[PDB]
Design a protein around this motif. Structure first.
Motif, PDB file in Angstrom:
ATOM      1  N   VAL A  13       0.763  -1.129   0.040  1.00 45.22           N
ATOM      2  CA  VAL A  13       0.166  -0.029   0.016  1.00 45.22           C
ATOM      3  C   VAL A  13       1.012   1.068  -0.106  1.00 45.22           C
ATOM      4  O   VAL A  13       1.739   1.521   0.721  1.00 45.22           O
ATOM      5  CB  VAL A  13      -0.716   0.021   1.284  1.00 45.22           C
ATOM      6  CG1 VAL A  13      -1.782   1.381   1.238  1.00 45.22           C
ATOM      7  CG2 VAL A  13      -1.612  -1.286   1.241  1.00 45.22           C
ATOM      8  N   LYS A  14       0.557   1.934  -1.009  1.00 46.77           N
ATOM      9  CA  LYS A  14       1.404   3.222  -1.043  1.00 46.77           C
ATOM     10  C   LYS A  14       1.030   4.305  -0.019  1.00 46.77           C
ATOM     11  O   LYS A  14       1.765   4.755   0.529  1.00 46.77           O
ATOM     12  CB  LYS A  14       1.656   4.022  -2.505  1.00 46.77           C
ATOM     13  CG  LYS A  14       2.003   2.786  -3.653  1.00 46.77           C
ATOM     14  CD  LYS A  14       2.030   3.433  -5.026  1.00 46.77           C
ATOM     15  CE  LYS A  14       2.977   4.926  -5.049  1.00 46.77           C
ATOM     16  NZ  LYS A  14       2.804   5.528  -6.496  1.00 46.77           N
ATOM     17  N   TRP A  15      -0.420   4.239  -0.123  1.00 51.02           N
ATOM     18  CA  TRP A  15      -0.862   5.375   0.770  1.00 51.02           C
ATOM     19  C   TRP A  15      -2.233   5.032   0.764  1.00 51.02           C
ATOM     20  O   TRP A  15      -2.904   4.449  -0.394  1.00 51.02           O
ATOM     21  CB  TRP A  15      -0.529   6.786   0.595  1.00 51.02           C
ATOM     22  CG  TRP A  15      -0.799   7.079  -0.947  1.00 51.02           C
ATOM     23  CD1 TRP A  15      -0.051   7.208  -1.965  1.00 51.02           C
ATOM     24  CD2 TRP A  15      -2.254   7.662  -1.361  1.00 51.02           C
ATOM     25  NE1 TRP A  15      -0.609   7.732  -2.912  1.00 51.02           N
ATOM     26  CE2 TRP A  15      -1.938   8.110  -2.766  1.00 51.02           C
ATOM     27  CE3 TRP A  15      -3.350   7.838  -0.596  1.00 51.02           C
ATOM     28  CZ2 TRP A  15      -3.125   8.590  -3.519  1.00 51.02           C
ATOM     29  CZ3 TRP A  15      -4.305   8.532  -1.468  1.00 51.02           C
ATOM     30  CH2 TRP A  15      -4.283   8.842  -2.743  1.00 51.02           C
ATOM     31  N   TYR A  49     -12.883  -1.507  14.701  1.00 57.79           N
ATOM     32  CA  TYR A  49     -13.316  -1.677  13.431  1.00 57.79           C
ATOM     33  C   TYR A  49     -12.575  -0.641  12.573  1.00 57.79           C
ATOM     34  O   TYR A  49     -12.947   0.697  12.832  1.00 57.79           O
ATOM     35  CB  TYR A  49     -14.844  -1.550  13.258  1.00 57.79           C
ATOM     36  CG  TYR A  49     -15.432  -0.743  14.244  1.00 57.79           C
ATOM     37  CD1 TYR A  49     -15.814   0.703  13.545  1.00 57.79           C
ATOM     38  CD2 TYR A  49     -16.035  -1.074  15.393  1.00 57.79           C
ATOM     39  CE1 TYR A  49     -16.212   1.434  14.462  1.00 57.79           C
ATOM     40  CE2 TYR A  49     -16.643   0.078  16.295  1.00 57.79           C
ATOM     41  CZ  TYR A  49     -16.763   1.133  15.689  1.00 57.79           C
ATOM     42  OH  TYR A  49     -17.242   2.003  16.536  1.00 57.79           O
ATOM     43  N   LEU A  50     -11.794  -0.651  11.805  1.00 54.11           N
ATOM     44  CA  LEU A  50     -11.171   0.540  11.000  1.00 54.11           C
ATOM     45  C   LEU A  50     -11.512   0.253   9.562  1.00 54.11           C
ATOM     46  O   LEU A  50     -11.454  -1.001   9.052  1.00 54.11           O
ATOM     47  CB  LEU A  50      -9.958   0.562  11.147  1.00 54.11           C
ATOM     48  CG  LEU A  50      -9.535   0.696  12.709  1.00 54.11           C
ATOM     49  CD1 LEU A  50      -7.732   0.690  12.946  1.00 54.11           C
ATOM     50  CD2 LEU A  50     -10.147   1.890  13.214  1.00 54.11           C
ATOM     51  N   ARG A  51     -11.786   1.275   8.775  1.00 52.37           N
ATOM     52  CA  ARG A  51     -11.797   0.953   7.413  1.00 52.37           C
ATOM     53  C   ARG A  51     -10.425   1.343   6.505  1.00 52.37           C
ATOM     54  O   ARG A  51     -10.526   1.695   5.564  1.00 52.37           O
ATOM     55  CB  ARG A  51     -12.782   1.970   6.812  1.00 52.37           C
ATOM     56  CG  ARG A  51     -14.427   1.509   7.247  1.00 52.37           C
ATOM     57  CD  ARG A  51     -14.679   0.157   6.854  1.00 52.37           C
ATOM     58  NE  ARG A  51     -16.089  -0.048   7.471  1.00 52.37           N
ATOM     59  CZ  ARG A  51     -16.213  -0.680   8.620  1.00 52.37           C
ATOM     60  NH1 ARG A  51     -15.138  -1.432   9.396  1.00 52.37           N
ATOM     61  NH2 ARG A  51     -17.536  -1.020   9.178  1.00 52.37           N
ATOM     62  N   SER A  52      -9.508   1.545   7.343  1.00 51.88           N
ATOM     63  CA  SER A  52      -8.232   2.059   6.694  1.00 51.88           C
ATOM     64  C   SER A  52      -7.260   0.862   6.641  1.00 51.88           C
ATOM     65  O   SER A  52      -7.554  -0.141   6.915  1.00 51.88           O
ATOM     66  CB  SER A  52      -7.512   2.853   7.751  1.00 51.88           C
ATOM     67  OG  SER A  52      -7.178   2.343   9.004  1.00 51.88           O
ATOM     68  N   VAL A  53      -6.312   0.995   5.757  1.00 50.49           N
ATOM     69  CA  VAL A  53      -5.256   0.248   5.502  1.00 50.49           C
ATOM     70  C   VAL A  53      -4.071   0.600   6.031  1.00 50.49           C
ATOM     71  O   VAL A  53      -3.797   2.095   5.815  1.00 50.49           O
ATOM     72  CB  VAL A  53      -5.139  -0.093   4.087  1.00 50.49           C
ATOM     73  CG1 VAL A  53      -4.325  -1.511   3.731  1.00 50.49           C
ATOM     74  CG2 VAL A  53      -6.599  -0.368   3.535  1.00 50.49           C
ATOM     75  N   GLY A  54      -3.217  -0.192   6.307  1.00 49.91           N
ATOM     76  CA  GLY A  54      -1.918   0.228   6.659  1.00 49.91           C
ATOM     77  C   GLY A  54      -1.078   0.803   5.682  1.00 49.91           C
ATOM     78  O   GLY A  54      -0.873  -0.072   4.535  1.00 49.91           O
ATOM     79  N   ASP A  55      -0.224   1.806   5.834  1.00 48.20           N
ATOM     80  CA  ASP A  55       0.560   2.251   4.601  1.00 48.20           C
ATOM     81  C   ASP A  55       1.798   1.672   4.772  1.00 48.20           C
ATOM     82  O   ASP A  55       2.562   1.229   5.961  1.00 48.20           O
ATOM     83  CB  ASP A  55       0.872   3.671   4.853  1.00 48.20           C
ATOM     84  CG  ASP A  55      -0.260   4.613   4.540  1.00 48.20           C
ATOM     85  OD1 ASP A  55      -1.552   4.320   3.878  1.00 48.20           O
ATOM     86  OD2 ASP A  55      -0.676   5.449   5.622  1.00 48.20           O
ATOM     87  N   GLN A  84      -3.934  -4.403   9.766  1.00 51.40           N
ATOM     88  CA  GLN A  84      -3.749  -3.805  11.204  1.00 51.40           C
ATOM     89  C   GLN A  84      -4.458  -2.500  11.057  1.00 51.40           C
ATOM     90  O   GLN A  84      -4.932  -1.714  11.873  1.00 51.40           O
ATOM     91  CB  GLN A  84      -2.158  -3.391  11.359  1.00 51.40           C
ATOM     92  CG  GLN A  84      -1.906  -2.804  12.589  1.00 51.40           C
ATOM     93  CD  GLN A  84      -2.391  -3.864  13.839  1.00 51.40           C
ATOM     94  OE1 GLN A  84      -2.063  -4.931  13.946  1.00 51.40           O
ATOM     95  NE2 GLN A  84      -3.165  -3.200  14.686  1.00 51.40           N
ATOM     96  N   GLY A  85      -4.326  -1.926   9.827  1.00 51.76           N
ATOM     97  CA  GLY A  85      -5.013  -0.670   9.591  1.00 51.76           C
ATOM     98  C   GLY A  85      -3.879   0.487   9.684  1.00 51.76           C
ATOM     99  O   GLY A  85      -2.738   0.058  10.033  1.00 51.76           O
ATOM    100  N   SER A  86      -4.413   1.669   9.800  1.00 52.72           N
ATOM    101  CA  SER A  86      -3.780   2.892  10.037  1.00 52.72           C
ATOM    102  C   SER A  86      -3.488   2.645  11.238  1.00 52.72           C
ATOM    103  O   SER A  86      -4.059   2.394  12.056  1.00 52.72           O
ATOM    104  CB  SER A  86      -4.036   4.391   9.563  1.00 52.72           C
ATOM    105  OG  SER A  86      -3.160   5.370   9.426  1.00 52.72           O
TER     106      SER A  86
END
Length: 90
Positions: A13-15, A49-55, A84-86
Motif C-alpha cells: 500500500v503506497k498510501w 473496526y477500521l476502514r483504513s489500511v496500513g501504509d 492492522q490498519g493505519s
C-alpha cells in the motif's frame, strides 16, 4: 460474476487516505498501480473496526476490472489475516 483480471496478488500500500476512503496499492507482482477502496477491505481488525489500511504494509488482494481499469477486491493481510490498519484511524 464480474471479471477477475488477477487473483490473489501481493502488493504494497503506497498510501491510503481514510478521509477519501480510498488509496492506491502498488502491485508487487506486476508493478502496476491498483485502485483500492475501503469497500474492498473484506476483513477489518477485530480489536477496532477500521476502514483504513496500513501504509507501507504488504497485503494480499484479488484484482478485478474496475472503472479506473483495475480495482482491488478482497483486500486482506497476508495469510488472510486482518489488516492492522493505519496507526490512527476513526
Amino acid at each position: 460474476d464480474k471479471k477477475v483480471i488477477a487473483t490473489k496478488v501481493l502488493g504494497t500500500v503506497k498510501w491510503f487516505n481514510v478521509r477519501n476512503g480510498y488509496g492506491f496499492i502498488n502491485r508487487n507482482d506486476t508493478k502496476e498501480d491498483v485502485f483500492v477502496h475501503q469497500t474492498a477491505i473484506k476483513k477489518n481488525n477485530p480489536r477496532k473496526y477500521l476502514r483504513s489500511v496500513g501504509d507501507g504494509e504488504t497485503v494480499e488482494f484479488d484484482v478485478v476490472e474496475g472503472e479506473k481499469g483495475a480495482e482491488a477486491a478482497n483486500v486482506t493481510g497476508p495469510g488472510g489475516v486482518p489488516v492492522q490498519g493505519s496507526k490512527y484511524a476513526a
